[PDB]
Amino acid sequence: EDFADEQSLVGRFIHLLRSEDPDQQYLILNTARKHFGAGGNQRIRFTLPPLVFAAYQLAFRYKENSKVDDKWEKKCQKIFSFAHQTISALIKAELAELPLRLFLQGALAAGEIGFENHETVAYEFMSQAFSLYEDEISDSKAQLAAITLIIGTFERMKCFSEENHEPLRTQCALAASKLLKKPDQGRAVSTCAHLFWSGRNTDKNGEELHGGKRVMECLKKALKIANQCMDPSLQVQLFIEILNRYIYFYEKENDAVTIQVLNQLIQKIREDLPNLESSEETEQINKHFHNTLEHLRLR
Amino acid sequence: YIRMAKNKEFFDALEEIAESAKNDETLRNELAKVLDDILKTDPSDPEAFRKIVAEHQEFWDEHDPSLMEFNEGRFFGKSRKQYLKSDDFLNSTDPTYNFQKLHQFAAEQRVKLGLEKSDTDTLVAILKNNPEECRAYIESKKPGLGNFSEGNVHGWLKEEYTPTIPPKAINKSTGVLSDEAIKRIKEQARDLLLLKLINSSGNTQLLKDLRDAMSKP
Amino acid sequence: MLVLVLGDLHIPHRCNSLPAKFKKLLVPGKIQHILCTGNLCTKESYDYLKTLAGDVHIVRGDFDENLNYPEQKVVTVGQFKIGLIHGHQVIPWGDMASLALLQRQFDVDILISGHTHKFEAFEHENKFYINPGSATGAYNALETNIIPSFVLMDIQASTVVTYVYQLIGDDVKVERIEYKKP
Numbered sequence: 001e002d003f004a005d006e007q008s009l010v011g012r013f014i015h016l017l018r019s020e021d022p023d024q025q026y027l028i029l030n031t032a033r034k035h036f037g038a039g040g041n042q043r044i045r046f047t048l049p050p051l052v053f054a055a056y057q058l059a060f061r062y063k064e065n066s067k068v069d070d071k072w073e074k075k076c077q078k079i080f081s082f083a084h085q086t087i088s089a090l091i092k093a094e095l096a097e098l099p100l101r102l103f104l105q106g107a108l109a110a111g112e113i114g115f116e117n118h119e120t121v122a123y124e125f126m127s128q129a130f131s132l133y134e135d136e137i138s139d140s141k142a143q144l145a146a147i148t149l150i151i152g153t154f155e156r157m158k159c160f161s162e163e164n165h166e167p168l169r170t171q172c173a174l175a176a177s178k179l180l181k182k183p184d185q186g187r188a189v190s191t192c193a194h195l196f197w198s199g200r201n202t203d204k205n206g207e208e209l210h211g212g213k214r215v216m217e218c219l220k221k222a223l224k225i226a227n228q229c230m231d232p233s234l235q236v237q238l239f240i241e242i243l244n245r246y247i248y249f250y251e252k253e254n255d256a257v258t259i260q261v262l263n264q265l266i267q268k269i270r271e272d273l274p275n276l277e278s279s280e281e282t283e284q285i286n287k288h289f290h291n292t293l294e295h296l297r298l299r
Numbered sequence: 300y301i302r303m304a305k306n307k308e309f310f311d312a313l314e315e316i317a318e319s320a321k322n323d324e325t326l327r328n329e330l331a332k333v334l335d336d337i338l339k340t341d342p343s344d345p346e347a348f349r350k351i352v353a354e355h356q357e358f359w360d361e362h363d364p365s366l367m368e369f370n371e372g373r374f375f376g377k378s379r380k381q382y383l384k385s386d387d388f389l390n391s392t393d394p395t396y397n398f399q400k401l402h403q404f405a406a407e408q409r410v411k412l413g414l415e416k417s418d419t420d421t422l423v424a425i426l427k428n429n430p431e432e433c434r435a436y437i438e439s440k441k442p443g444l445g446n447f448s449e450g451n452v453h454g455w456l457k458e459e460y461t462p463t464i465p466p467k468a469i470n471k472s473t474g475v476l477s478d479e480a481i482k483r484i485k486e487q488a489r490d491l492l493l494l495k496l497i498n499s500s501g502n503t504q505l506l507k508d509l510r511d512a513m514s515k516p
Numbered sequence: 517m518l519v520l521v522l523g524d525l526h527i528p529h530r531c532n533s534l535p536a537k538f539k540k541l542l543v544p545g546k547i548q549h550i551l552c553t554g555n556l557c558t559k560e561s562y563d564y565l566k567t568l569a570g571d572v573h574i575v576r577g578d579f580d581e582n583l584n585y586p587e588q589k590v591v592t593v594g595q596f597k598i599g600l601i602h603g604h605q606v607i608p609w610g611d612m613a614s615l616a617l618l619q620r621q622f623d624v625d626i627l628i629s630g631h632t633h634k635f636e637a638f639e640h641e642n643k644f645y646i647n648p649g650s651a652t653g654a655y656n657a658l659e660t661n662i663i664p665s666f667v668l669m670d671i672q673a674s675t676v677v678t679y680v681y682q683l684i685g686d687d688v689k690v691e692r693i694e695y696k697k698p
Contacts, residue, residue: 004560011532053530057655101578108657145587149578152607156658191607198608244617251613284623291620298641462537462688464546464668465518466679 007046010036014054022065025058026079033086041093052086052102055079056109063113073116080110080121087128096136100146103129104153111159122159126150126168133175140180144188147175151191158200165201173218183234186225190245193218197254212256215249223265232276237285239269244292251299301369301377301387306396308366309352309359309389310404316362317408321415326361331412333358335446337405338475341453342398345391346384353383402454407480409445410437411487417443419495419505423512425488430478433485434470447475517594518546520569522651522666523553523602523630527561529579530654535664535683538651544568549593553630553648554602555579577602577630590622594671595697599624603631603647609658610647612640619643625697626676632656635665637678642698646678653683 010032017028029051036047059079062072069075083106090099107125110118129150137143151172160168172195176188196214200206219242226238243265250257269289276282313334320327333355340351352359359366369388371379382388391398414422421440428436435458438447447455454475460466476484499505520542527533534542547569554577556562562582565572576585589600599622606614610632619627626644633656635649646667650656653664663682670677678693 004558007528008532008560011528015532049529053526053655056657060660105657112657142583145576148607149604152604152609155608194607198611241621244620248613248617287623288621291623295616295620295641460679460690460692462541462681462690464541464543465670466668466690466692 003042003046006043010047010050014050022058022061022069022075025061026075026082029055029058029082037086037089044089044093045095045098048086048090049098049102052083052106055082055086056106059109059113063115076110076113076115077117077121080106080125084124084128091132096132097142097146100129100132100137101149103132104149108153108157111157114159119159119161119164122157123164123168126154127171130168130171130175134178140184143179144184147172147179147188148191150175151188151195155194155199158202158206160201162201162203165199165203169195169199182225182229183238186222186229186238187241189218189225190222190242193222193245193249197249197252210254212249212254215254216256219246219249232272233281233285236269236272236276237288239265239272240285240288240292243269247292247296301382304387304390304393304396305366306389306393306401310396310401312359312363312366313404313408317412319362320412324416327412327415329358329361331409331445334405334409334412335451337402338409338445338452342402343453345398348398348401349384349389352389403475403477403480406445406447406452406475407483410476410484413440413444414484414487414491419492419508420512422488422492422495423509426485426492430481431469431471432467433481434472434476435468437476438470439468447472517548517671519549519551519593519669519671520547520666521551521553521628521646521648521669523577523648524555524633524650524654525557525561525652526555526579526650526654527558527652529555529557531652534652537683537686537688538664538666538681541681541688542568549573549591551591551598551600551628553577553600553628554585555630557581573600575600575602578604588622590624594676595674596671596676597623597625599627601627601629603629615645616640616643619645626695632659633662634659635663635667635680635682637667637680637693639695644676644678644695648680 014028014032019025032051033048037044059076062069062075062079065072087099087102087106090102103125107122107129110122110125133146133150137146154168154172172192173189176192177185179185179188193215196209196211196218198208200208222242226235226242229235229238243262246257246262246265250262273286273289316326316330320330336351336355340347342348353367356367369382377385377387389398424436425433437444438458441448446452449455449457452475454472456470456472458468458470460468496505525531525534533539544567549571550565550569551573552565552575554575556574557577557580559582562574573589573591574585575589576587587601587605591598591600599619601618603610606618606629608614610629615627615629624643626646629645629647632647633650633654634647636645636647638645648667649665650662651664651666653662656662663684665680665682668679668681670679675694675696678695680691680693682689682691
């Protein structure tokens with residue numbers, strides 16, 4: 001109540017004053033933080049996030065100013081450094097989840113913008129989350145969501161060189177296996193299958209990796225983590241979730257994924273399916289498969 | 300020469316024929332074809348408007364052959380073909396009966412025609428629906444009140460929709476069925492309703508079916 | 517029946533409120549079902565949507581502050597079996613095939629995604645996929661073409677009219693796409 005109204009009123013203010021002079025905006029933002037990153041740990045928690053977003057926007061605004069401003073590339077840096085300081089001051093108010101993603105959307109941002117000395121501020125934002133990931137993320141539930149985000153965030157980005165793509169790729173692979181539960185591993189590892197294919201990186205002039213082999217690695221590894229799930233109902237669905245995710249990679253012209261794997265993976269799942277009891281949980285996955293037949297039937 | 304335009308005659312002759320067709324259903328279905336043809340064809344283009352009307356000579360001679368005719372003999376440089384796509388048969392810029400206005404009329408009559416023997420849900424609809432809305436509804440009852448779709452009538456637009464949350468489908472095709480024109484049509488709707496309403500002086504399905512079109516939330 | 521589909525509000529994170537004309541439209545007593553894709557994020561915005569309709573179906577979205585919202589969800593309304601998910605969950609963020617994958621796994625006739633802040637709706641292998649886009653029209657790193665939008669469905673039964681409400685300029689420009697059960 002005293003924490004809900006006040007947080008609305010910083011949303012308001014940075015907008016009330018809104019100019020179309022970039023530098024003025026910057027002064028405002030700055031002059032917001034000055035006067036709204038103060039009162040203990042009660043406000044600073046849910047008052048700064050705005051400004052961090054609001055900064056990213058302003059960073060974009062300097063890229064519209066491509067020709068008007070010469071010092072725009074230096075002004076981008078000035079802003080991102082304004083983020084770093086501002087997200088950090090949430091960490092120093094003992095916070096975990098919020099600042100993690102705030103780095104990420106920033107990390108995206110610089111990525112899409114593409115300014116001078118940017119790739120350096122790309123990495124720093126990513127690993128800052130990752131350093132929050134392992135340092136402060138416990139509960140296997142939100143440990144999953146917090147890792148899958150990091151993956152798809154990265155996936156999208158094209159702004160990295162091979163020399164700095166590789167370590168973050170497999171930094172994920174670690175965090176994928178380092179989950180608590182068995183199903184949560186096996187999916188998350190299969191989610192890491194993408195980063196080696198459609199995870200972009202400026203090496204073939206802003207193109208996909210097309211690295212079909214390193215996909216198969218991260219699909220095998222899951223299937224082994226598939227056997228290692230005790231429950232029969234886990235096992236079958238996990239085989240199917242991996243089957244469909246196999247299919248996707250065939251349909252995207254990847255010839256690393258061959259029929260051998262698929263028929264064997266299918267046949268397996270034809271035979272395992274009857275063993276589950278005729279019930280509600282069981283009435284779903286027997287449809288899932290039925291739909292994965294027919295999708296494959298046309299194609 | 301021939302220095303008076305058939306515009307006014309043709310125009311008026313439709314109103315005559317439409318009257319006859321109220322009873323004669325074989326003439327109605329015949330008239331509809333004629334009206335549809337004028338509507339589909341483009342009064343921006345002069346020749347085509349002249350073309351399409353003249354091509355329906357067989358129909359222009361069913362009621363009143365005096366429309367098409369002219370003395371083809373003893374007139375130099377006003378040969379038979381030359382007149383039927385001339386400015387003299389039909390003046391492109393007649394200040395009153397502009398090709399446009401005849402089009403805008405044609406449609407008016409088209410709707411009135413199909414009105415004649417359409418059902419009670421229809422009449423009631425045409426009264427409730429506002430100028431914009433009524434135009435939409437006329438498409439919605441295709442092709443009974445006439446073929447009004449993007450390609451079957453020249454001046455017709457794409458159906459648009461309101462910000463109001465259940466979003467009403469409307470039309471802003473004033474270049475065919477003017478707000479003026481549509482007001483006439485409503486008039487003929489309630490004429491046709493009121494007149495029908497007197498002739499069953501107790502109960503029956505009209506007064507059930509009216510209550511259905513009326514109480515429709 | 518009338519299904520209000522929206523999401524990606526980011527209140528207060530990215531935007532201070534909904535666009536004046538959108539709040540003006542969305543009044544209580546015109547909706548039965550809501551399918552919000554998330555990023556509300558606060559209780560403020562849950563309590564808004566609960567006013568608008570009796571039935572309300574949120575999902576968990578990347579910035580949501582509440583834990584209790586459900587990541588994935590499905591609902592049968594009318595003849596239709598709809599799927600609902602914030603859409604960051606799908607990788608590569610908002611790809612085609614990944615959104616079809618997720619259909620099969622769900623077995624749904626309609627499938628609502630989000631996160632891109634960009635409206636889409638289309639028929640693909642006899643099944644339908646929606647995305648209302650940003651109700652607020654908030655920031656996005658990947659896109660800078662943001663058109664504040666929400667969707668309304670009229671499921672008659674075996675026939676769904678998919679109205680899409682966009683705010684171009686300061687006028688509310690609505691288009692429509694009808695889809696029907698195969």
